[PDB]
Amino acid sequence: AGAARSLSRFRGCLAGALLGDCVGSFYEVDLTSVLRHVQSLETEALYYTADTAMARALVQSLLAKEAFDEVDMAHRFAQEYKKDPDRGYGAGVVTVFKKLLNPKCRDVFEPARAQFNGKGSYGNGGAMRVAGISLAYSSVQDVQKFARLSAQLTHASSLGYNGAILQALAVHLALQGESSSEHFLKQLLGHMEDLEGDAQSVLDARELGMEERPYSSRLKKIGELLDQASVTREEVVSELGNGIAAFESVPTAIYCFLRCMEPDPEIPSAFNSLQRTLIYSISLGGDTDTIATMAGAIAGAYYGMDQVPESWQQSCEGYEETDILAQSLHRVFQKS
Ligand SMILES: Nc1ncnc2c1ncn2[C@@H]1O[C@H](COP(=O)(O)OP(=O)(O)OC[C@H]2O[C@H](O)[C@H](O)[C@@H]2O)[C@@H](O)[C@H]1O
Ligand SMILES: [Mg+2]
C-alpha cells in the first residue's frame, strides 16, 4: 500500500513470505482441505523452514555489508546451516554448505558449479530466498544482477538462477504497486525472453531436453490460463508444476498471485487478497512451503502490511525479526 517501495510494501513483502513458508509447511491437498485448517490461525507455534532461514541470512548479509558481498553471504548461508541444519534443506545443497565451511575454499562460487555432475542445481532454493534482493535494489538491472549472483552461490544452472531472477523481478514489479495482471505478466515475459536468448541458457535447457526458453514458455501459458474458463488445480499443476524445480514452482507462484488479484467465489470473501493468494497457492499441493513463500512475497509487496493479518503473522516463528529486517532494508537501502 501507498507509494512504490514504501515501508508498508517492504514489511508486507517479508511478512507475506514468512506467512507462506510457515502456513504452507503444514501440508508439505484440496481447497476444502486448506480452509478447514487456517481455522487454527483464528504464539509462534509455526516453525519456518529453510526458505526463511536462507532469506534471513541473505538479508543479514546485505545489511552487514550495505552491499552484495559474495564471501559474506556464502559464509552466512553456510553458518546458518551449521547452526540449524534441520530446517528442511534440499538434499543436494547441503554439500555446498559443507564445502563452504572449509576455510581453504576461497572461491565461494565453485562448490555450486560442481553440483549434479557439474551441471548445477535447478532447484528453487535460489528463488525461495531472493525477495530481499528486490528490497535492496531499485533498478531492474541491479535486481537481475544480484538475483543471479546470490542464487549462483548454490544454483549454478541457468535453470536455477533464472528462476531466482524471475522471482526477484516479480517482487520488484509488485513493489511498484497497482497494475493489471496482463501488464505485470507482459513485463515479466519481456525480461525472461531477453535472458533465455543467451547461449548458456539455451544450451543448459537443450542439455535437459526442455523447451527452448522454458520460463518464457511457462509465462505464456500463464497468459493462456488467465483467459481460460473453469481452470482446475490439476490443469495448473500440469501446465506450470508444483515441484522443487525452479521452473515447476516460480511461474506457479506468479500465477497464484495474478489469479488471486480478483475475488474467487470458492474462497470466502472474509479472506483478504493476501490470504486468498496464500490459500490458493497451498491448495495446489506439492512444494507448498516454497510456492506459498514466493507467492506471499509478491502479494505482500503488492498489497502491503495492511493485509498481513495479526493472528496469522503472530503464529509464525520469527515474525518480529522478519519485520525488523524489512524495516532495516528500507532504512539502509531505500534510504526511507
Ligand atoms: N541438475 C539436477 N538434476 C537432477 N535433480 C536436480 C538437479 N537440480 C536440483 N535437483 C533436484 O532438486 C532438489 C533440490 O535441489 P537442491 O539444490 O539440493 O536444493 P534447493 O535449495 O534448490 O531446494 C529447495 C527446496 O528445499 C527446501 O525444502 C525448500 O522448501 C525448497 O522446497 C535436489 O535434491 C534434486 O532432487
Ligand atoms: Mg519447499
Author numbering: 14 to 41, 46 to 59, 70 to 363
Sentences from the paper on this structure:
ADP-ribosyl-acceptor hydrolase 3 (ARH3) cleaves PAR and mono(ADP-ribosyl)ation at serine following DNA damage. In the active site of ARH3, acidic residues, including Asp77, Asp78, Asp314, and Asp316, maintain the integrity of the bimetallic center and render the ideal alignment of the substrate for catalysis.
To gain further structural basis for different alterations in enzymatic activity in D77A and D314A mutants and to better understand the roles of each Mg2+ ion in ARH3, we determined the high-resolution crystal structures of ARH3D77A and ARH3D314A bound to ADPR and Mg2+ at a resolution of 1.85 and 1.80 Å, respectively. Thus, Asp77 appears to be important for the maintenance of integrity of MgA and the optimal orientation of the terminal ribose for catalysis. This lack of MgA causes a large-scale rearrangement in the active site. First, the terminal ribose is rotated ∼37° using MgB as a pivot. In this conformation, the 2″-OH group makes additional hydrogen bonds with side chains of Asp78 and Asp316, and the 1″-OH group makes a new hydrogen bond with the main carbonyl chain of Gly115.
